[PDB]
Design a binder for this molecule. Sequence first.
Ligand SMILES: Nc1ncnc2c1ncn2[C@@H]1O[C@H](COP(=O)(O)OP(=O)(O)OP(=O)(O)O)[C@@H](O)[C@H]1O
Ligand SMILES: [Mg+2]
Ligand SMILES: [Mg+2]
Lengths: 366, 495, 179, 53
Amino acid sequence: SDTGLAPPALWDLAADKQTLQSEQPLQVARCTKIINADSEDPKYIINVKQFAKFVVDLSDQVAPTDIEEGMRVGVDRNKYQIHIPLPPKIDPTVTMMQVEEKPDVTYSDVGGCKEQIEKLREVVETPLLHPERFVNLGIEPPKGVLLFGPPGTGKTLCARAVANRTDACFIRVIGSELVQKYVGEGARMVRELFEMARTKKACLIFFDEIDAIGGARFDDGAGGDNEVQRTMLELINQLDGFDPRGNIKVLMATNRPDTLDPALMRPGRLDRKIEFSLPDLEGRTHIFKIHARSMSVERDIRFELLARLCPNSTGAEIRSVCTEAGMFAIRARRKIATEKDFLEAVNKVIKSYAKFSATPRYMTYN
Amino acid sequence: ALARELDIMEPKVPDDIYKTHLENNRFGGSGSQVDSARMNLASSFVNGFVNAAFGQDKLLTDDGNKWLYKNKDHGMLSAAASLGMILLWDVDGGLTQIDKYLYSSEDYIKSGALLACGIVNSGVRNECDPALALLSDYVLHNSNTMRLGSIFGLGLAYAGSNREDVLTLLLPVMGDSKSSMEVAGVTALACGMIAVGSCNGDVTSTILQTIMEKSETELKDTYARWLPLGLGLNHLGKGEAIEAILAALEVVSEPFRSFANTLVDVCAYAGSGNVLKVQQLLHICSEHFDSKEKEEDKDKKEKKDKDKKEAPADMGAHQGVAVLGIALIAMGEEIGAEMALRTFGHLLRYGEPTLRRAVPLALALISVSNPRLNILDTLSKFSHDADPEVSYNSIFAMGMVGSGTNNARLAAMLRQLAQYHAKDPNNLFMVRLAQGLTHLGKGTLTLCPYHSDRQLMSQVAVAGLLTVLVSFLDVRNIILGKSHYVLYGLVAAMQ
Amino acid sequence: GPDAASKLPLVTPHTQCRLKLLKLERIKDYLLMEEEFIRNQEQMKPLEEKQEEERSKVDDLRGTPMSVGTLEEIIDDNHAIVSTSVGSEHYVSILSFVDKDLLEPGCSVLLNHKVHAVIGVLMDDTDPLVTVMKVEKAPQETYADIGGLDNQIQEIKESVELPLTHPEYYEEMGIKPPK
Amino acid sequence: ENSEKIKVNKTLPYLVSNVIELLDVKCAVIKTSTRQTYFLPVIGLVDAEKLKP
Ligand SMILES: Nc1ncnc2c1ncn2[C@@H]1O[C@H](COP(=O)(O)OP(=O)(O)OP(=O)(O)O)[C@@H](O)[C@H]1O
Ligand SMILES: [Mg+2]
Ligand SMILES: [Mg+2]
């Protein structure tokens, strides 16, 4: 035991006779890759993994059109005859980037970004859904969006939210995964990504934190960063590169917009740029509501006053006030918060921790 | 009013976007559109239900003439019923304009429309009770076809009604063998569920109408199973003092009397949690039939074991299912015993992944050896989590579509019409109360679709009759509303 | 996955309340019927023993020199591509004897040594990285030993220890614990 | 002869190899795609001049 013991009732359901009926009649094949289709009628050239490059034709049941150059196909283990086409090989590290479970956040937990949300839905949530509206006019909808702003403003939330409603496949990318040891295979992960996406009629790619692989072209004469630069070029070439990119709609959010190559920031690749500025008064008065809902309150709380006590407070700094104001109630042993509790919260998360912060040194985007 | 107007957001949900997320199927064909009615008919069923309660969210109705031309002559008869589902719970809104166009040709198309009437008229329980007045005339009219549609709708519309006039009135129509068998057979199921009390006069009369049948019809019928079901629920709670007459008077009958008598016992003994009564069912019954040619009885024996075991203090549920897998499938008979797949979903059907579905049922869903076996399990999954409002369900559904029996058309519509239909939102299917121990007597109607799909003679596989797979839905709503006399409105939270 | 112990931790009565007794007797009746339910059917149908016959046939279907390889991809169920020992990829056929659940893309697979196929998954050796940072128990330093810092011990207690011992507090005010 | 000639070719599976040195002491030395070298004394069913190293 401890290896593969499955539900014993399922073994008999496995029909051991059929298994014997399958552990003999079903010949085990070996993966291969086709290089040429030598003409005459059959005469396919083959390349097994690490045995040799043999010459094979067919068995009986694979239609000639079923096989094409550079297609994965299984072969006989004795006479080396093609029997079944095989899927192309996608790097497992690139195939794990596909999101299988939608994040549990919708387009109602981001507040104050009304204009940003609307401008982020006509390029990633309308060209795909209701795709006939644009047909009755000459419009290729913009393909690509850059979300930039100070840290803790909501760049990822508006992206994590879009994945909650999008019907097309959503592909992750962190911007640090595209950094790999050997020269070369940092562009393979950027070539395989789009090959997988093109296999999906509608696909979205979220190049989160595109600053580790999206730097500016810099030649110091001392062999500065080059592998990252090469990877960025492949990304730039696969968005408008003498080959229709397909239906892929990129979506990359950067913490440092003033660092990107002046070729990843032109229409065609990163078409529309959406600015995520610090919330205004009406904004942060709404962020407080969206984060203080599922909590006990005095009901009669001047949330507007609290909003105006933290003028340049990022969205994160507002949740920390709400998540900390109730903290002052857990300590007093009370179960219902109070405005005085929140005021002490603002005095700690906004004016007491302002020594470190991130907003003052980032709104210059440097 | 408070869902669309007050709420700022109001997006639309076209069917095409989510119909095929996996694009492997479309690859290679490159279009190749075909006029096959089998493909078209199944797709309409899925789309129609999702569009319910969407007055302005209709796009395939204004120009639906083209869809009518792309099918067979007899295909539209089954599709004609689906039109009514769109206008759900329309007492008079949809009927105002239909009457003016009634004086027209194409009377054949009218047959399918009536099937929709029964579903829409079910649950309203109007004091005037217009359903008989608006359905009795055509039933009595001399025509097998036009009254054929009326038979199904009448039973469902009067689930809460228990008037004896209708039950006796319907008996002669089914008792007339000069008409089609299906006409009488389909009706017999409807009448059984209407009466939940005793109904002594008709229960015995119904038995008589089954007794005076030839051996070939009685033996090889494939349709007599539903007969005890109506009687079984019509005799629930009866003791030995009542069944004594039935047993004593049923001692000069054919051996089939034992086949039917089995169902009554369980229904009467609603709560009878014990071991002595259950044991002879599995062992004594199984051994005795091995020496004779009689069959098709052990399957019903196992499915009814759910009774008096639904709520074992939330502790006997897990234990019961485990025994079934290692008992009814581990060494059971090759076909009949192995066909105890719809029992697991019957015991508890609300949606509870990772503990009761992936292991018990998901494993057997990939039985590619025999497509027929997958038929029972493919439909079994949809029943227990049809509307669970769980976002973590679609991953498993895509685990088989496009990777299994795709070339075969018979297995094609098994998964597409059911697996992709489990995305219906704002709907709940659990019928147990908050306590979870007090069941609803009339809410237990979700038991008929547990053996009909197995045989499939003009039932599922054969086109012409598919409303059987639409009538068993009887559940409550999942929406909770709060309001005041002057429409004040509160925002009180819940946990 | 499943837990061998804790069949029903219903200690809510926490006393001599009769409710404890009713549930226990329920299993006893079910056990009694199962006893003669298995042995009885095990005589006139001597096909599968389920204790010695069940294991025996699968072993023959397996091979004495069971192979070890890496599963590289998951083609349609009952079929997969497993990387051979050294460098070859085989389009093997998955046998139902495997749990069919632990087949993660790249963990491990046991294959027959002649007709190579999937015979069984293998648990993955604890990677050295896990053992590197898996601190077992703080040797001696207690929490009253630290001394001095008092107002600063409450913050750590209230962020990394309270939400795991008394979640109710960050359970009724609907506030997630400080990250 | 053609029936026998096809019999060797009828074994369609070939082993691709690259000619290394077309020695004239009209022989050939090949390097099969398995890291094995050989000294085919007779070139085979191909011209001795159409084969270049
Ligand atoms: N407008 C907003 N409304 C509500 N919550 C917000 C808003 N903006 C930010 N947040 C809060 O920010 C947190 C997550 O921040 P997020 O990672 O999206 O910010 P960011 O600035 O895009 O990130 P980074 O630059 O670190 O990648 C969440 O807890 C979320 O509640
Ligand atoms: Mg981010
Ligand atoms: Mg631009």
